[PDB]
Amino acid sequence: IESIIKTATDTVKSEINAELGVVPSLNAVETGATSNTEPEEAIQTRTVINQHGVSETLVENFLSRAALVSKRSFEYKDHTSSAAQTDKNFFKWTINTRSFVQLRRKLELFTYLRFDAEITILTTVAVNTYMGLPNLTLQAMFVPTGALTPEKQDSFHWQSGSNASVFFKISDPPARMTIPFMCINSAYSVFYDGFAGFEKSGLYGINPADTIGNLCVRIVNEHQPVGFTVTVRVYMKPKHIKAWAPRPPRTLPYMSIANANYKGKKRAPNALNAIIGNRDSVKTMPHNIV
Amino acid sequence: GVPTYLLPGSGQFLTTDDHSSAPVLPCFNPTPEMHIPGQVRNMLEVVQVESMMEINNTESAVGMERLKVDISALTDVDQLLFNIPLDIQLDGPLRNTLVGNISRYYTHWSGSLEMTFMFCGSFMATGKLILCYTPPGGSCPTTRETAMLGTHIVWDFGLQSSVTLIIPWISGSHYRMFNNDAKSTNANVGYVTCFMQTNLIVPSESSDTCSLIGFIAAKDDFSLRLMRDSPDIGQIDHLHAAEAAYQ
Amino acid sequence: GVPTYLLPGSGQFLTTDDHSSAPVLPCFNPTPEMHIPGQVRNMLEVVQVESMMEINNTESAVGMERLKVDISALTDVDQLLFNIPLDIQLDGPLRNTLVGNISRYYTHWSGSLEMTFMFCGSFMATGKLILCYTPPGGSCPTTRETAMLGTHIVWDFGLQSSVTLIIPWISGSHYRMFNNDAKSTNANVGYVTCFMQTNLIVPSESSDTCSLIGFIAAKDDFSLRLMRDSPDIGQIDHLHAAEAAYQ
Amino acid sequence: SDRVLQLKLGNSAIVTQEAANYCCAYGEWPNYLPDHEAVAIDKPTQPETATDRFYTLKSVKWEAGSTGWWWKLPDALNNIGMFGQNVQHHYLYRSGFLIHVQCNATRFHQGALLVVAIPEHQRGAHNTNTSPGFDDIMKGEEGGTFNHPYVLDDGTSLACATIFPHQWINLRTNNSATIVLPWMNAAPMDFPLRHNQWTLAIIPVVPLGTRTMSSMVPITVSIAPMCCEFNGLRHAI
C-alpha cells in the first residue's frame, strides 16, 4: 500500500519464539514475491529509532545531475580549402542521451521517463604563436527533428524566425535553457521494442518520438586571420522526473548508440560468459582477514 | 536601482545546482499524463527486490552456471559447501544485483540485508543446511563448530523450498563506506557460510547433484547516501554511430 | 528585470565573509547527532581551566623540571624565591598555558587571572610564603618590604596544600594589547613575586628541597577579542607526506 | 489454497492444482481505456469473449542444453483466432494479457524455469554493431530462442531480471506460472504489427535433470488477451 517514507524504518525488540504453525523464515520464491521475513522474526532485536533519511535515493535526485551529452570540437578558421565532410565553423547534433555512458546506463534503469531537460552549453577555445583568446559570440539554434538545418555558417536559416536561438559569449557564464517534455506520448520510451515505420525496413529500437531535436551551433563571428579550435560541451539535466518500470542495469559495455548490442570484455569482470571476476572455488574467501 | 555585489561562486556552473532556467519554447503544452504501471519514486523501492547472486563466480562456470551452487551427497559430516563475501563495493557475488548495482552509485550505506536461497532439487531430495552470518573481526569460519556461533538459520528442504537469512545491521557506525579497502573496519560487513547440517540424501532416480539459487534484497531499514558515478560502466572511445549524430 | 548596480567589494573573496553557498550534494542526509561528552561552545570555557606555568624556564631545567620550582631551607629572612613575568604575548612562563595559548589567537584581552600554587613537599614540611602581585609602573620588587605593599596572600602549608593569588584586573583601559612592546602602558600587567614569609622547615627524613607547581587560569570576567593567527606554529616548507596527498 | 486455481475466460478454462500465487504485474489489473485517457475519437470495438480467451501456442521441448524461449506480444497472437482478425482489420489496439505457462515432470525430476514478462524488451545482437532486423524480432507464433540468456540478449543481466513481473516453475514445488499483464505503453493505443509491449521469457536457470526414464518434457504457453479494444477499422493488410 502506498505511503510516505521520509526515513528508514525502525526496529522493534523481539523475544524468544517457539510457535507451531508459524514459520516466517521459510518463504516461496516461486510466487515471484520478495521475502517478507523481518529482522525481528529471524534474530532477537532491540528497539532502534532509525533516523536515516531516504531523500538522496529519490528518482528526482538520482537523475537530476547535469551530465555531458555532447562534446564537439571544430576548427574555427577560414574554410575555403577545407573538405566538405568537416565542420565549417558550425555543427549539427541530433540530441540524444545515448552517446556518453554514465547518463545512458542511469537513464536505462527505467523503461519510461517523463522529464524536462535543462540544457547547459559550455564553450571553450584554444589557439590553433599565441596572441590571445577571442571573446566570440556563438548561436545555438534549436531545430526540431527532421526539419531544415543550416548548411553554412552564413546561411539564411540562422535568422531564426520561429526557431529558438540562444546567443552567448565565451566570457559569459554558460548558456542555460530548459527544454520541455516534448514527446507526443505521455513518457519517453527509453527502450522501444518495435519498428518506427509501416514498412519492414525501418530501424529497430529507435522511436523518433523519443528524439528531442537538433542542436545547430555556429559561431556568429567571421574568421580572424589565425585559426582557433572551439570545443562545445552540452550538458543535460533532467528535471520534474517521473519514472516507470525499472530494468536490470547494463553489465556489458555499450557498442553503439543505435542499439543495445553487446560483445562483453575478453576476461571477467563484465565478460559475456562471466560478469563477476573469478575466485578459486565457491568456498574461497577473496579478502579473508589474517 | 538596487545596490548589489557578486559573491564567490558567481557565474560558475555546478552540475548539481537547483535553479530555474529559461524556457526554450514559451506557451508549450506538454502531453497529458497517462497512468503507466509501475512508477518508481525512490530508488530504495528497486533495492528491496531480490535478485540472484553469482555465488559460483569461478572458472569452468560459464554463463548461467554462475547463478547456481551445485551441492551433492557427502560422506563426511559438518562440511562446508560455499561462502559468500559481503563486500558490495568489491566485485564479488553481490555486485550484479539490484541491491548491488544501485548501491555502487553511492558511497555510504546502512541497513539490513536478506539472503533468500531456493532449493532446486527434486521432490525426493531431502536435506538440512545451516546458513551462518559472521560479524567481522577475524577470518572467515571454515568449520561448522566455529561458524554456528554467529547468526544462523537451519533449513530443512520440504514443502517450502526457501529460507531467508536476515543479515542484521551490526555496525559501530551509522553507515559503512564503499572504500577500496575491503579489510577496513568501516567497510567489512562479515561473512556468510553454508554447511551441511545433515546431508543431501536422494534416491536412485533423483539426480544426485542438486542446486541452490541465492537471492539478495535489502530490507526497508536500508539507506544509501553520498552519490557517485558507477564503476560498472565506462568508455575509452566514442561509441559506434555517435559521429553519425553529427552528420 | 530588476535594475541593479555593483558596489565596491563586488566579486572579492574575503576570508571572513558569512554567506550561504551552493550545496555540492543535494538532498544529502547528515548523520544523526549523538550526545558526545564535553562540548565546547565558547573558547572562554577552555581558558578558565588551570594549567601549569613553566616558572623554571631556565637552562639546566630539562623537560619536566621546568614545571616545578624547588624551594629550600634558607638561613636569612625575607628572601625572594621566584618571580613570574605576566606578559601573555611574550614567551614567558604564561605562554604554554590554556589561558596563554588561546589568548595568542587574539590581540586584546581583559579580565582577572588566578595563580594557583600546589605545594608538593612532604607532610612533615612546614612553611609560610607570601605571593605578591605588583601593579605596573616601576621595576619588579626585589625585597619583601617593597613587594608586600601590593596585592598579596600569605600561605601556610598545612591540610590544604594550595592557595590562589587572584591577579585583579587593574587597568586604565578596558583591554590590554598583545603588542610587541612588553614595556608599554597598554600591555604591561605587572609582576608576581614569591618570598619566604617564615621558612621551609623540614625534619631530618623529609627531603630538604621541596617543590611548588604553579597553575594559571582565567576568571569568568575574562574576555578576548580581535582575532589573529598564532605565532606559536608555523612552517617554512611543506610537511612530510603532503605531496603524497596529490599522488 | 493458493495451489489450486481455475482461470475462466470466454469459452476457455484452465484448472491447475500445483501452482503458485499468481502475479499481477506492478500491482495492476487490466481495464478498458477510460474517457479521460482516450485519444482516438471513433467508437472502439470490444469483442470480449471472441478475443478475451486463452490462446495456446506450440509447445517447446525442454531439453539438455536449452538456453531459453521468448514470445513477443501481441506479435505471438496476431494471426490466431478472432484476436488476429481484429488485429489485421484495425489500425489501433489495446489489451492486457493473462499468460499461463505449463511445465510438469515427475517427482524425480529437477529444474527451475524463470518465467519473466519483460516490458519493451529491445534486443541486441552479439559481436556486431548492426541492429537486429525484422526477422530477428518478429518471429510470430513460434517465438524465438535466447542466444545469451545470461545477459538477456541485451547486455543487461538475468540476475537482476526479477525486477520484472515474473514467477518461477521450480519442478519440486509447482508446475505452472501465471502472470497477469496490463497495458504497458507510453501511448494509450498502439499499432500492433510494428510494436511489442511485452516479451514473455522462459529461461532455464537450473537445467532439467533426473536419473529415471527419459520422457519429453514440454513447456506450454497459454496466453489470454484481456480487455481488448480495437480502433481504426479498415481492410486487412
Partner: peptide, 30 residues
C-alpha cells in the same frame, strides 16, 4: 525563485516521498 511564465521552467521538485515497494516486492494477488 521562478520568474518565468512557464511551469516547466521551475527548479527540480525534490519532495516526492511517496513509496509503494509492494508493486515490485509483493505483486502476488493473495
Amino acid at each position: 525563485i521562478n520568474f518565468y511564465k512557464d511551469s516547466y521552467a521551475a527548479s527540480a521538485s525534490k519532495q516526492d516521498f511517496s513509496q509503494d515497494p509492494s508493486k515490485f516486492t509483493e505483486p502476488v494477488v493473495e
